[PDB]
């Protein structure tokens, strides 16, 4: 939970600094400063490691060819006045703007489609960082975009400490070292800047350790299918 992370930061890592309040808990006024750094740390960990991969269904409309990955066009977000909401969200999968990289794209039946392929004029291109361009949209089709997902963003004004930070206990130290590095690096004092650099190096060492141990089952080899494809 966020309370545990705040206590851990207050005593042990952010101890000899103002934000830690001498190990008596993070002040209720410095929340929008640890939370901003925490969002960056969670984004870094969720982009460098595959801690959350999710899929989103994009319903194709006859007059729309550029589909934006924004919650304003979501089926569950009822606050938006968009006439056509092509994102197909469910109470289970909500699509809270947590998109880090669009990896794979499928169709309604389940056949993979090419992504960003120029020679094949049947591929789904990506114009901008959050858009999906379908040159050939059909009113009776739906996409099945799968992406690497981010942690649901914790608002800067969040006050409830029961908001759960969903990271494995192995990356707790990596996140904490990242937060310490980011908070220690703001000041231009050489002595404090050196500590910030040391925290950055230690965070990059923890990440290297987790990569070397593959605690998230990311770098796992697959069955070779090249002989079958080449006709052996």
């Amino acid at each position: 939970k966020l309370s545990e992370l705040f206590q851990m930061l207050s005593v042990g890592e952010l101890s000899l600094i103002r934000t830690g309040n001498d190990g008596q808990g993070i002040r209720t006024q410095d929340y929008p400063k640890v939370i901003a750094q925490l969002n960056a740390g969670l984004t870094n960990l969720h982009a460098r490691f595959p801690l959350l991969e999710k899929e989103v269904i994009i319903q194709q409309y006859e007059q729309i060819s550029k589909y934006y990955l924004r919650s304003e066009f979501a089926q569950m977000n009822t606050t938006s006045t968009e006439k056509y909401k092509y994102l197909m969200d469910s109470p289970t999968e909500r699509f809270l703007d947590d998109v880090i990289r669009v990896e794979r794209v499928f169709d309604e039946c389940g056949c993979p489609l090419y992504l960003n392929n120029e020679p094949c004029c049947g591929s789904i291109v990506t114009p901008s960082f959050d858009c999906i361009q379908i040159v050939y949209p059909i009113e009776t089709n739906a996409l099945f975009v799968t992406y690497r997902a981010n942690h649901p963003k914790i608002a800067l004004t969040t006050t409830d400490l029961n908001t759960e930070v969903r990271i494995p206990a192995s990356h707790e130290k990596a996140l904490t070292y990242y937060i310490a590095s980011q908070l220690y690096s703001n000041s231009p004092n050489p002595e404090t800047a050196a500590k910030g650099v040391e925290w950055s190096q230690r965070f990059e060492a923890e990440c290297t350790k987790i990569e070397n141990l593959d605690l998230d089952n990311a770098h796992i080899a697959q069955t070779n299918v090249k002989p079958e494809m080449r006709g052996w």
Partner: protein, 50 residues
């Protein structure tokens, strides 16, 4: 004239913006420091160091 006793509260009020003489001298030095710092001439670390 009425002379007043010299007490501890005439030197330091134990507050940063105190009414003492040392506090007023600190406020005056901090005024020049803030005037220089408002022109991006010194960083916060150097501000506190001086």
């Amino acid at each position: 004239v009425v002379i007043e006793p010299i007490t501890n509260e005439d030197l330091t009020t134990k507050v940063v913006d105190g009414t003492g003489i040392f506090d007023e001298l600190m406020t005056a030095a901090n005024a020049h420091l803030s005037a220089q710092w408002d022109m991006e001439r010194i960083t916060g670390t150097q501000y506190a160091e001086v």
